[PDB]
Paper text:
Stalled ribosomes at the endoplasmic reticulum (ER) are covalently modified with the ubiquitin-like protein UFM1 on the 60S ribosomal subunit protein RPL26 (also known as uL24). In a pathway analogous to ubiquitin and other UBLs, post-translational attachment of UFM1 to the lysine residues of target proteins, UFMylation, is catalysed by an enzymatic cascade of E1 (UBA5), E2 (UFC1) and E3 (UFL1) enzymes.
We engineered a stable mimic of the UFC1~UFM1 thioester bond by replacing the active-site cysteine residue of UFC1 with a lysine to generate an isopeptide bond between the C terminus of mature UFM1 (Gly83) and the ε-amino group of the introduced lysine (UFC1(C116K))10. To understand interactions between UFC1 and UFM1 independent of the UREL complex, we determined the crystal structure of the stable isopeptide-linked UFC1–UFM1 mimic. When compared to other E2–UBL structures in closed and open conformations, our structure reveals that UFM1 adopts an intermediate state. This conformation is stabilized by multiple contacts between UFM1 and UFC1 α0, which is a helical extension beyond the UBC fold of UFC1. Taken together, these data suggest that UFC1 α0 may prevent UFM1 from readily adopting a closed conformation, therefore stabilizing an intermediate state. We therefore postulate that α0 would need to be remodelled during E3-mediated activation of UFC1.
Numbering used by the authors:
A (entry chain A): 0 to 161
B (entry chain B): 2 to 83
The structure:
Amino acid sequence: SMADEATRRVVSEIPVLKTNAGPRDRELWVQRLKEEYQSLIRYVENNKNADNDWFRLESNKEGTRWFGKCWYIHDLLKYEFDIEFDIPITYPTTAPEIAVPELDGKTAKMYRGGKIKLTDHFKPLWARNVPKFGLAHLMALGLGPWLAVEIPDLIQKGVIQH
Amino acid sequence: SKVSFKITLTSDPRLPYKVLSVPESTPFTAVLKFAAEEFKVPAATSAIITNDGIGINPAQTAGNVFLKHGSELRIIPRDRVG
């Protein structure tokens, strides 16, 4: 199917990460962060080339606190949302929880503090790929599909206006 | 007396599949439980649909589904609360 081939190609083109290291791990964390930025930068380049440049992410110096923006296009109009997340100390085994704070209280597919609720298939998928998945995969396989489902709904109901 | 289904896990970007063979009289809900077990995903937050994206009534046998829909199925994450 066209959906299948699209996902496969998208995810295939995101560089896999290498280093099993989290914030506790000194020079090995520095290396991991380089990998994360490299993977994110390649994903953004791919997004630009596919005419769907849908997010930007940055971090503090230590790489433990991430914030950025995402965009969703629906019916010719652009919707912008702020995102943030903290890196758990057991990363990359444990995936961060992405938050969209301005949507807190606006959808039931979300925990406290705007933390998005992904499907139950996300955790096993992440766990069996450790440590090759990183924040670029978290965006492509976590937030992106969440937006694709939730944002059109919130628009159709008039809960978000652009 | 058995039928085989090709079941693809759509939540995994490799799109891996397994072929599951069950007696024709097996309730289709058992096929869903078998597929979920095999892919190591919860049955209660998974669903099976046809290769072409069609909903399947669970209240029928495997053989029923095999002829009505076809051998090729997708196991997908389900819409479920909490």
